[PDB]
Structures are given as structure tokens and as C-alpha cells.
Amino acid sequence: PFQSYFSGNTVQICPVGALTGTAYRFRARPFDLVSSPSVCEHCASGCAQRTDHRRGKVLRRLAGDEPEVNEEWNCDKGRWAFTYATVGDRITTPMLRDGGVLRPASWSEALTVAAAGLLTAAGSTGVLVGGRCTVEDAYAYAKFARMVLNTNDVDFRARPHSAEEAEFLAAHVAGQTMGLRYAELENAPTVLLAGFEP
């Protein structure tokens, strides 16, 4: 097989209907697509993309055009890994633990129970934020943990990690943006990859 992580680009680069995505096949024509600019959720590359959806279902995600980030390219993950939210496992309503079973609950009841439990847990609470949250979402998690739960036990690292990693991120990463850019990678005479598989 073709077998490359960038195969979808060949679909987007073909000036005719020769190469086509089997996922998008016969599912829509341009006029009925709702198309919106987007950013890929998966990697830290932050590719600009164009999400196309019909009748409320995302059909494809084209590479967009961000010369400073990804130019006109994606990996297959960003192009096609958008069906996760519609595989049937999505939680559609707030849930509560009643009788040991997870039962659908109203927003009011769920919020009330969660607030009661958190207050009963006062300072003895941890906040695992995960790496999927947006900058705003992660900020909300941190602000909730420190202002509401009055705890510093906040960590987005849902993966192998170390305290040395936290110290390094604070020292050299946090609060320092645009120190290196894609445009600089293309021009760097030497690039040393440590613990990184690009």
C-alpha cells in the first residue's frame, strides 16, 4: 500500500478526481459543505485546517494555508481523525453515580452534587487536566483549582513525566513564546533531536 502518514495530502494536491479520500466518497458536493477554519487537536504542530461538515457531521479536514506553521500540508491523523466524537461513546448529558450505576442527570442536579462533593473535599483535591484542553480550558482548570479548590495540585501531564520535567518547563518553556519557529527549523544548520521522533 501507499503507507505514509501524509497520504491525505496527495488527495488534496490532486487537481482532478483521480486521487480521492475513501472516507469522503460521495458524501457531499462543495455547495452543501459548511466550511470553517480550524486547528488540529492532535499534535503540538497546530496546523491550520479547514473543517468541512454536512448536516452537522464532519466529512473532511483539508490542510488550509498557514505558511508559518504547516504551509499546505497535514498528516493523516489531522485530516481523518475527526470521527472520535461520533462513535457512540460520547457523553450526551451530565451523569451521576446513583446506586453504583452511572445514571443520566440534569445539569442542575449534577452541578449541585459536584459542588457539594468538592466542598466536602476542601483542600484534599487533585485536578488532572490532561493534554487535550485548549489554552483557555487549561487556564480555567488552573483557576478553578487554585481559586475554587485552593489547591496547587494541578497537572496536565497524563503521560510519563517527572518533576525535573516540571522544573524544565517552568525555567525554559513557560512564558517564552516564539523563541523558535518553523521558519527557523528550515534554516537551522544543525538540528539535534533528543527524545523526539518528529
Binding site: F26, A28, R29, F31, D32
Partner: protein
């Protein structure tokens, strides 16, 4: 002078001419052959649907 009464001669006359109303619904009137009635999806003589789902319509 009778010209001002011409309208009377009209209506009375029409009172003796056959009404021109179409007999719908019992006897529906003839629509134009080209009339834009309900859309219809057609088949080939062997029964296959003609619609290829091109969405051009």
C-alpha cells in the same frame, strides 16, 4: 346615451352564455403540457434508477 348602460347588456348577455368554469375537482381542467408539477425520479426501461446522486439538482 345608451352607451352608459353598456355594462348591463354585458352581464345579462353572459347570464345566457354557458359558464366557463373548469369542473375541478370532479372534472379537472387541462394544465399546460409544460407545467411545473411535482418532481419525479425516473427509471431506465430495465428498472434501474436514473438518478446518479450527482446533487446537481
Amino acid at each position: 346615451f345608451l352607451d352608459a348602460l353598456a355594462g348591463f347588456a354585458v352581464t345579462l348577455g353572459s347570464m345566457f352564455k354557458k359558464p366557463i368554469t373548469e369542473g375541478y375537482p370532479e372534472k379537472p381542467g387541462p394544465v399546460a403540457p409544460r407545467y411545473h408539477g411535482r418532481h419525479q425520479l425516473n427509471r431506465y426501461p430495465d428498472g434501474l434508477e436514473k438518478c446518479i446522486g450527482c446533487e446537481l439538482c
